[PDB]
Each structure stands twice: as C-alpha cells, then as structure tokens.
C-alpha cells in the first residue's frame, strides 16, 4: 500500500513514538509527476499525530518508518489514499500518489 524510497537519510535512530507530533514538509504529485499540493509553496510545515486517522493510511504507515532528518518518496496505492473517489478538484479517481516527505522534527 505504501513504498518508501529514501532521498536523503535520517539519523536512523529517532522515529515517531506514541504521543509525539510529526512536523514535516511535503510535495504531493500524481503518477505523471505533476504536483497537486506542497507545504513548501505556502512555507508552512504540516503537523500531525499517528494513530488518530489524521492522515491517509499510506502516510500513517510510511512516515512511521522515517527518522528525523529523512527525506523520502512515498508511493501510495489508492487503497492507502483516496481510492476510487479521489479528492474533489485535486486528486482524480483511482490515483496512485507520490509524496516527497521530509521529517523536520518531532514535538
Ligand atoms: C477540517 C478538515 C481540514 C483538514 C486540513 C488540514 C489540517 C490541512 C492539511 C495540510 C491538508 C491540505 O490542506 C491544504 C490538503 O492536502 C492534500 O492536498 C494533500 O496533499 C494530501 O493528500 N495530504 C495532506 C498531507 C498529509 C497526507 C494527506 C492527508 O492525509 O490529508 C488529510 C486528508 C484530506 C485525509 C482524508 C480525510 C477523510 C478520510 O475519510 C479520507 O480517507 C480516504 C482521508 C488531511 C490532513 C485531513 O486529515 C485533515 C483535513 N482535511 N480536510 C478535508 C478532507 O477537506 C489533500 C488532497 C487535501 C487536503 O485538504 C483537505
């Protein structure tokens, strides 16, 4: 449902743990490589917690594997993203997504 391909390594030691908030930057693209969203465009890190349905499942399972400082490409099947529906005006139906995600820090 999610493949993780590292772009730049993290420290390999500091992973998200229960009660912590992940602070990330991301860019989301479709399979054709075209961007549909990026926190870097608005220069606003995205904060979320694991275990609360705060993100699509591909992020839930992918970012949980990342360590602080890591930049990774997450390739997410529709089951782990927006499935047959998509997201109105942004993501088409049945869309495999590619996110470039950087774990900036844990809070
Ligand atoms: C009150 C709600 C506002 C609230 C919005 C924010 C905290 C802002 C946050 C940065 C999201 C971005 O705002 C510019 C947008 O980012 C994307 O462009 C993106 O790149 C993108 O894919 N993501 C953003 C970065 C993480 C991975 C992923 C993600 O998981 O996004 C959450 C989301 C829409 C989950 C669905 C939720 C329902 C559930 O059933 C579905 O299961 C199939 C999944 C999103 C964090 C959600 O949990 C919280 C919200 N939702 N608003 C909604 C749904 O309208 C997606 C396509 C759309 C997002 O705007 C809604």
Author numbering: 1 to 107
Authors' own words:
FKBP12 proteins are members of the FKBP PPIase (peptidyl-prolyl isomerase) superfamily and catalyze the cis-trans isomerization of proline imidic peptide bonds. The immunosuppressants first bind to their respective immunophilins, FKBP12 (12-kDa FK506 binding protein) and CypA (cyclophilin A), which subsequently bind to calcineurin in a groove between the CnA and CnB subunits. The immunophilin-immunosuppressant complexes inhibit calcineurin serine-threonine phosphatase activity, blocking the dephosphorylation of downstream targets, such as the human nuclear transcription factor NFAT (nuclear factor of activated T cells), involved in T-cell activation and interleukin-2 transcription, and the fungal transcription factor Crz1 (NFAT homolog), implicated in virulence, stress response, and thermotolerance. To this end, we characterized high-resolution structures of the Mucor circinelloides FKBP12 bound to FK506 and of the Aspergillus fumigatus, M. circinelloides, and human FKBP12 proteins bound to the FK506 analog APX879, which exhibits enhanced selectivity for fungal pathogens.
